[PDB]
Amino acid sequence: ITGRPEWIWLALGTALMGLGTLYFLVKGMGVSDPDAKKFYAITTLVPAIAFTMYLSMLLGYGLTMVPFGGEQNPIYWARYADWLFTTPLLLLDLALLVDADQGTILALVGADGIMIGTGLVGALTKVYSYRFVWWAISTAAMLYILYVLFFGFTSKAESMRPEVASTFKVLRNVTVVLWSAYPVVWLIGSEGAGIVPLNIETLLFMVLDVSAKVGFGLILLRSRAIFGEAE
Amino acid sequence: ITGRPEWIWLALGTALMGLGTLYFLVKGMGVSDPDAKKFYAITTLVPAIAFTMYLSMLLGYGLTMVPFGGEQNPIYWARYADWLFTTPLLLLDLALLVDADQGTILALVGADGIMIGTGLVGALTKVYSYRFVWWAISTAAMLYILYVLFFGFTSKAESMRPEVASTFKVLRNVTVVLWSAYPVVWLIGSEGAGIVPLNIETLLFMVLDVSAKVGFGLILLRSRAIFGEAE
Amino acid sequence: ITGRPEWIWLALGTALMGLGTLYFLVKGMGVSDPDAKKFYAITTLVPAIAFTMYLSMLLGYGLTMVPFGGEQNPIYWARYADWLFTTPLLLLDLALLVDADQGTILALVGADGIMIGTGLVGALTKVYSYRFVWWAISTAAMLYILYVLFFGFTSKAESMRPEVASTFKVLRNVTVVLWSAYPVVWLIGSEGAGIVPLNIETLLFMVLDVSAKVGFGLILLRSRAIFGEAE
Ligand SMILES: CC(C)CCC[C@@H](C)CCC[C@@H](C)CCC[C@@H](C)CCOC[C@@H](CO)OCC[C@H](C)CCC[C@H](C)CCC[C@H](C)CCCC(C)C
Ligand SMILES: CC(C)CCC[C@@H](C)CCC[C@@H](C)CCC[C@@H](C)CCOC[C@@H](CO)OCC[C@H](C)CCC[C@H](C)CCC[C@H](C)CCCC(C)C
Ligand SMILES: CC(C)CCC[C@@H](C)CCC[C@@H](C)CCC[C@@H](C)CCOC[C@@H](CO)OCC[C@H](C)CCC[C@H](C)CCC[C@H](C)CCCC(C)C
Ligand SMILES: *C/C=C(C)/C=C/C=C(C)/C=C/C1=C(C)CCCC1(C)C
Ligand SMILES: *C/C=C(C)/C=C/C=C(C)/C=C/C1=C(C)CCCC1(C)C
Ligand SMILES: *C/C=C(C)/C=C/C=C(C)/C=C/C1=C(C)CCCC1(C)C
Ligand SMILES: CCCCCCCCCCCCCCC
Ligand SMILES: CCCCCCCCCCCCCCC
Ligand SMILES: CCCCCCCCCCCCCCC
Ligand SMILES: CCCCCCCCCCCCCCC
Ligand SMILES: CCCCCCCCCCCCCCC
Ligand SMILES: CCCCCCCCCCCCCCC
Ligand SMILES: CCCCCCCCCCCCCC
């Protein structure tokens, strides 16, 4: 484990995702509202999945070597197995908050799968220049997601209860800022141009992951928007 | 790329799926009917997924070598990753058109997963004679799907609006004819008996894919069956 | 095939899953109740999936070698591909029986995916002591599932029709007893401590699989709880 300088950030990430999972699990014990139960189930699964994948990276299972640039490059593939399941769950939290229609939910989840799937292909591609073709396709899929979150959901939240509109607006802004950083870290990190070393890259993804999952969840599950209007 | 004679058909397929995706995306911009939005989302995702997998084959990522018959045989595995997601989406288009019940939808999607999954196992199997055992199981799963589309959905469409009944009947006939060709191309192509060479096999799958996805989508999204009855 | 002593139990399992699939398929022909159709579709898919994965193990495709303990250990990975899809389908049978809320269904299916996913990682892990870390995480996920089936569903079934309450109680008890045996067989078998040899381990999993899928299905599909109350 300790033979890799980035191990400290993988261990911290593992701990923070595990602690986040347990807090949400305990906090959700005393909840019977069927609407609130939906948000607790979605939001608790997110850091639980991330916990297992951070642990796999810490123990060395989620790491492979990819030859490109005449070098064997360490690629943590477990990140994409994490994101494949956690990013659509996070979008479902937002879509259920605004009572989005089914067709829009399917478009979001499908574009998200394309985003993560093409990012994985780009991470494992051995022809250096082709890695950035996949990065560009994946980034186009992300821009579609961000467009929908702004010019489809925002207008839908305003016609909703005030507390669900204000909570959505906050979580929307958090998501757009944090998610946009991921393609940048990829491009300048060891998967892309190799400007930033792997140990610093790992620290950046850990800060982003914890903020986008645990921080996101703390804002959502403390809001009254997750409960139905009741007397 | 150009070192493979089949590259021209992979490049054409990539272009036609990309163009198809963009047309459906633009055409769906001016749509607010929640029913129509469902069909546009399903139908636009189909060629978008196929685009990415054709590109992976063009660039050489979606290709592996499988030893059988005393030879290293080029097997494009990316086809099955495509079909795993696009064939159930196409069946969902048909099932939603006739307002099929949930139990029937699950049976269709499950049989479809078995069809594609066993076809993938057959494509990667190293014992030559066993490849055709998997082909037979996969073909049995397809025949179940075709039976349901005829002796379960057809009777359901007649009790529906006339425009949804006539549109379903057309898309049903297109699907049964085109899908039935796939097991035949597999059997006589490089995955099976090896009668037809890979470059011709690739041309045939490209014609079938574009027809079953883009051609299918053009018929559906030009129909009024996708809109609810409104004044 | 016959070069492996466990082949006899893989062949028996294949036959019993295939026969089970055909019986459920025939029995479900004469069913039009939309509620009953749901249970028949879920319950017939379970042994059909298991059939294909037992066949892959029989023919040698679903087997790999994992080095640990200074030895190349035969690991049947196809079991986890089976369980990944069949265990959530079995939980869906139970959840639909008691009309569970959506949030609870998602929590069950998500915990089940974590259970199977971490068990697969543990089966393929090359550092011997780490294999049991994954076993423990997977077992914690199972205990969560069992808790929900007892202290969330049981109370919900009592407020239901008497026949659905008594049928659920029976299937609940069958599930908790049979599922609990799996982590024990893993721990003492070739994936874990290696006390029980592989051929005996394979026999035990076959008895458990057939009972948990075909036996489970025979109890459910003979009950009147799967039909709506009708005159
Ligand atoms: C509606 C939305 C959900 C739609 C989703 C969008 C999606 C279509 C976007 C594209 C996804 C696609 C790129 C997934 C590729 C997975 C692949 C990286 C797995 C590893 O295989 C890659 C190479 C080794 O580098 O295999 C070496 C050769 C091996 C012999 C490969 C044989 C196994 C194949 C991988 C079998 C295909 C399985 C499916 C891809 C499983 C789904 C994986 C997940 C990442 C989507
Ligand atoms: C309700 C419906 C959706 C049900 C679906 C029906 C489905 C059950 C039908 C059978 C599907 C099954 C054959 C999928 C097999 C995937 C497999 C080809 C992936 C590549 O692995 C094959 C060998 C190399 O040749 O791995 C070499 C050895 C490696 C060490 C393998 C270890 C990884 C395992 C593959 C882990 C299992 C992952 C799941 C199979 C992922 C789903 C893939 C998709 C193709 C279903
Ligand atoms: C809501 C719920 C459904 C959530 C589900 C819970 C889930 C997150 C729990 C953890 C699942 C995770 C451990 C799955 C790992 C699959 C992995 C074993 C496949 C084989 O790859 C392992 C190594 C060889 O030993 O690959 C060698 C290196 C290769 C180069 C690997 C590159 C391919 C990657 C495997 C791509 C990721 C694909 C996804 C993991 C596909 C889903 C598989 C299924 C088992 C979940
Ligand atoms: C909890 C994890 C989250 C919210 C991860 C989000 C990840 C992304 C938005 C990743 C995007 C990428 C691109 C847009 C292209 C480059 C490759 C990716 C996958 C890093
Ligand atoms: C857009 C792609 C489509 C509609 C693909 C359809 C593919 C099939 C219907 C494939 C069927 C197969 C068999 C029936 C057995 C032989 C292997 C397959 C997977 C080619
Ligand atoms: C039809 C198959 C069924 C119902 C299989 C159930 C399997 C389990 C409940 C497996 C549980 C495991 C653990 C709890 C940890 C050890 C590894 C597993 C996956 C065997
Ligand atoms: C979206 C965030 C990207 C900003 C990356 C900042 C990295 C600064 C760290 C110093 C770079 C290390 C280079 C010298 C080793
Ligand atoms: C009462 C609110 C705080 C509860 C404690 C939460 C502990 C989980 C770890 C959170 C750290 C990361 C927060 C986002 C920066
Ligand atoms: C379902 C369509 C299958 C028909 C295949 C027709 C192939 C004819 C092309 C000529 C065969 C090439 C053999 C000589 C190289
Ligand atoms: C107005 C209808 C035609 C629009 C142009 C569609 C261009 C997408 C490519 C379609 C070619 C394949 C059609 C099926 C044979
Ligand atoms: C949950 C069931 C686990 C019980 C396992 C009993 C196995 C007894 C078979 C004899 C053990 C073989 C050891 C000598 C070869
Ligand atoms: C009339 C009920 C029996 C029908 C025959 C079922 C045959 C399928 C194989 C069942 C054997 C396994 C039963 C569970 C132990
Ligand atoms: C490729 C993996 C995608 C599945 C991720 C799991 C979450 C799915 C959310 C589905 C939302 C409901 C759509 C109607």
Ligand SMILES: CCCCCCCCCCCCCC
């Ligand atoms: C194995 C991958 C299957 C999933 C394909 C994605 C489409 C799923 C459609 C689900 C239809 C809704 C069923 C109720």
Ligand SMILES: CCCCCCCCCCCCC
């Ligand atoms: C185009 C939709 C408007 C909202 C999206 C904001 C774009 C942020 C740019 C992200 C940069 C990634 C490289």
Ligand SMILES: CCCCCCCCCCCCC
């Ligand atoms: C048996 C259901 C009737 C409709 C299915 C038509 C069968 C077409 C044969 C396809 C040939 C594939 C080898």
Ligand SMILES: CCCCCCCCCCCCC
């Ligand atoms: C803790 C929830 C109560 C019901 C679960 C029964 C636990 C059975 C123990 C299984 C042993 C697996 C190692």
Ligand SMILES: CCCCCCCCCCC
């Ligand atoms: C080795 C660098 C080659 C540059 C390729 C950049 C491709 C980016 C595509 C974005 C449209």
Ligand SMILES: CCCCCCCCCCC
């Ligand atoms: C090398 C050819 C061996 C023939 C096997 C055919 C199997 C087909 C099974 C269809 C029932």
Ligand SMILES: CCCCCCCCCCC
């Ligand atoms: C080689 C045996 C090492 C023992 C590790 C046991 C780990 C079990 C963790 C359960 C909390």
Ligand SMILES: CCCCCCCCCC
């Ligand atoms: C609940 C605390 C979980 C912390 C265990 C993971 C941290 C790795 C320490 C080496």
Ligand SMILES: CCCCCCCCCC
């Ligand atoms: C929108 C046009 C997309 C065409 C790019 C793919 C074709 C491959 C050319 C080499």
Ligand SMILES: CCCCCCCCCC
């Ligand atoms: C319907 C009977 C299915 C039996 C075939 C599988 C058994 C393997 C025999 C070698």
Ligand SMILES: CCCCCCCCC
């Ligand atoms: C993106 C930063 C999240 C901050 C988490 C703190 C929330 C406390 C209510």
Ligand SMILES: CCCCCCCCC
């Ligand atoms: C299967 C052939 C499809 C033909 C596509 C043309 C549709 C234009 C309306």
Ligand SMILES: CCCCCCCCC
């Ligand atoms: C767990 C044992 C199941 C027994 C199956 C027999 C059911 C006949 C109704």
Ligand SMILES: CCCCCCCC
């Ligand atoms: C109005 C809410 C502002 C939230 C933005 C937070 C950016 C990290």
Ligand SMILES: CCCCCCCC
């Ligand atoms: C909408 C604000 C985008 C912020 C992008 C930050 C990328 C590091």
Ligand SMILES: CCCCCCCC
């Ligand atoms: C490929 C772009 C299509 C141009 C608009 C078609 C008419 C909606």
